[PDB]
Amino acid sequence: VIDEIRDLLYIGKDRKNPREDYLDVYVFGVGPLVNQVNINALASKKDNEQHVFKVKDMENLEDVFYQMIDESQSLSLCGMVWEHRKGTDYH
Amino acid sequence: AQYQKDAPDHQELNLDVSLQLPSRSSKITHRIHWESASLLRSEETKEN
Ligand SMILES: *[C@@H]1O[C@H](CO)[C@@H](O[C@@H]2O[C@H](CO)[C@@H](O[C@@H]3O[C@H](CO)[C@@H](O)[C@H](O[C@H]4O[C@H](CO)[C@@H](O)[C@H](O)[C@@H]4O)[C@@H]3O)[C@H](O)[C@H]2NC(C)=O)[C@H](O)[C@H]1NC(C)=O
């Protein structure tokens, strides 16, 4: 089903435009009973980045969600060029 | 005596050879001069 989704979003069907930033898949592992092979093949594989996670006892995964709202991300509007179909210069 | 000073040993070599492939997006451009002549510039492509 995952390969049918990437075909519908035009991902990988071109050599000049991969469009990998238009689908991200994150898989979280809840228990000790975890097949790490199956959770890795479903998640995306983008460069210098992690998408597979394995934790135990559930409550620590609730501990990562209150911790992420204390974490502030420095948002950077610099160097952003998104492909808008009005490709005159200075865009 | 003016002939032996103005005599060239070779004609110009300066070849702006650019290669466009439909598998890529950038043109692969080499400039071959006299000193850098007789030097193969291999570009391998696994797609036919
Ligand atoms: C979303 O999807 C649609 C559908 O695929 C896509 O439409 C495409 O738009 C581009 C322009 O943004 C089209 O590209 C050009 O189309 C004209 C005819 O309309 C051609 O004549 C052009 O060929 C010349 O121009 C190029 C430079 O502009 C030269 O490099 C080239 O050698 C020629 O001289 C050019 O192909 C494209 O045809 C359509 N495709 C379809 C199937 O309609 C749209 O752009 C997508 N949106 C985004 C943001 O990508």
Query: Of all atoms in ligand 1, which is nearest to the CA of residue A83?
Result: 49
Report strand pairing: A52-54 vs A27-29: parallel
Q: What is the resolution of this structure in A?
A: 3.9
- A71 in ligand 1 pocket by Cβ < 6 Å? no
Cβ-proximal residues to B32 (8 Å cutoff; 6+ apart), any chain: B13, B14, B15, B17, B39, B41
CA gap B8, B1 in Å, rounded: 14
In DSSP terms, A87 is beta-bridged to: none
3-state secondary structure of A62: helix
- A83 in ligand 1 pocket by Cβ < 6 Å? yes
Q: Which of A33, A25, A30 is nearest to A49 (CA)?
A: A25
CA gap A5, B27 in Å, rounded: 33
Residues 6-45 of B with CB under 8 A from A: 23-25
Query: Of all atoms in ligand 1, which is nearest to the CA of residue A85?
Result: 49
Method: X-ray
Q: How far is B21 from chain A (nearest CA, A)?
A: 11
CA of A61 to the centre of ligand 1 (A): 46
- A85 in ligand 1 pocket by Cβ < 6 Å? yes
Token pair for B28: 């692969």
Cβ-proximal residues to B34 (8 Å cutoff; 6+ apart), any chain: B10, B12, B13
